[PDB]
Amino acid sequence: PQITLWQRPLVTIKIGGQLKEALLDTGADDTVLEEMSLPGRWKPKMIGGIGGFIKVRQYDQILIEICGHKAIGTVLVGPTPVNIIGRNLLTQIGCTLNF
Amino acid sequence: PQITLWQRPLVTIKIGGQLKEALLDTGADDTVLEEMSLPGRWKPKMIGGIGGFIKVRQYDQILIEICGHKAIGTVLVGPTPVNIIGRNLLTQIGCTLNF
Ligand SMILES: *[C]C(*)(*)(*)(*)([C]*)C(*)(*)(*)(C(*)(*)(*)(=O(*)*)N(*)(*)(*)C(*)(*)(*)(*)([C](*)[C@]1(*)=C(*)(*)(*)C(*)=[C@](*)(*)C(*)(*)(*)(*)(*)(*)=C1(*)(*)*)C(*)(*)(O*)C(*)(*)(*)C(*)(*)(*)([C](*)C1(*)(*)(*)=C(*)(*)(*)(*)(*)(*)C(*)=C(*)[C@@](*)(*)=C1*)C1(*)(*)(*)=N(*)(*)(*)C(*)=C(*)(*)(C(*)(*)(*)(=O(*)*)C(*)(*)(*)(*)([C])[C]*)[N@]1(*)*)N(*)(*)(*)(*)C(*)(*)(O[C]C1=[C][C]=[C][C]=[C]1)=O*
Numbered sequence: 001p002q003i004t005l006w007q008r009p010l011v012t013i014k015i016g017g018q019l020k021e022a023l024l025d026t027g028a029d030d031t032v033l034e035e036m037s038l039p040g041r042w043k044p045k046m047i048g049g050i051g052g053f054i055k056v057r058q059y060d061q062i063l064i065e066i067c068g069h070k071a072i073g074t075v076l077v078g079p080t081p082v083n084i085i086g087r088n089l090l091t092q093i094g095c096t097l098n099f
Numbered sequence: 100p101q102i103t104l105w106q107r108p109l110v111t112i113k114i115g116g117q118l119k120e121a122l123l124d125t126g127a128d129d130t131v132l133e134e135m136s137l138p139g140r141w142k143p144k145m146i147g148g149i150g151g152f153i154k155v156r157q158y159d160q161i162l163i164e165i166c167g168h169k170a171i172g173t174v175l176v177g178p179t180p181v182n183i184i185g186r187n188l189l190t191q192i193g194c195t196l197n198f
Contacts, residue, residue: 003196005186009125024196025126026108027183032149050131050179052150069198080149084126087104095198097102097123099166099189 014065028086032076069093113164127185131175168192
C-alpha cells in the first residue's frame with residue numbers, strides 16, 4: 001500500500017494473540033511496544049530517543065503480523081507512549097520511503 | 100528517490116545558509132534540528148519523544164532544501180541527538196511510505 005503522511009502512519013499489528021495499532025516509524029532503529037503480556041525470556045537493554053533513555057524488555061524471534069504481513073524479530077517492550085515499528089521490521093515487510 | 104530502510108534514511112538539507120544530514124521520519128510530527136545558528140523570533144515549545152520531554156524553540160516560516168526540494172515550515176531547534184525531518188515537512192516534499 002501507498003501510505004501518505006498527512007496523518008500519523010498507523011497500522012494494525014497482531015502480536016502474541018492480540019491486536020494493537022502501531023506507528024510505522026522510519027526514524028526508529030528498533031521496534032518498541034508499550035508494555036504487554038508476551039511469552040518467554042527476554043533481556044534488559046536500554047534504548048535512546050529524543051528526551052532520554054528508557055529501560056526495555058528485549059524480545060527476539062517474535063512473530064508480528066504488520067498490516068496483515070507476517071515477519072519475525074526483536075521487539076522491545078517498555079515505557080513508550082506509542083507502539084513503534086522500526087526499520088528492523090520495515091525491511092521485512094519490504095517497506096520503502098518514496099518522494 | 101526511493102529509499103529502502105536497511106540503514107538510516109539520512110538526506111542532505113540546507114537551512115539558513117548551512118548544510119546538514121537529517122533523518123526522514125514518519126514517526127515525527129515535527130521537524131527538530133539540533134541547536135543551530137538560525138535567526139528570527141522563536142517561541143518556547145515542548146515535545147515528547149520516547150525518553151520524555153525537551154524544551155525547544157519554535158521558528159515558523161523557515162525555508163529548507165531537503166534533496167534539492169525546498170519546502171517551508173516550522174522548525175523546532177533544541178537538544179535532539181540527530182536532525183529529524185517530521186511529517187510537517189515530509190508531506191510538503193511528496194513523501195509516502197510504501198510496501
Ligand atoms: C527506537 C527508538 C527509541 C528511536 C527513536 O526514539 N526515534 C525517534 C527519532 C530519533 C530520536 C533520537 C535519535 C534518533 C532518532 C522517533 O523516531 C521516535 C518517535 C516516537 C514517538 C512517535 C509518536 C509519538 C510519541 C513518540 C518520536 N519521538 C519524538 C517524536 C515526535 O513526534 C516529537 C517531534 C513530538 N516522535 N531511537 C533510535 O536510535 C537512537 C540512536 C542510536 C544511535 C545513535 C543516535 C540515536 O532509533
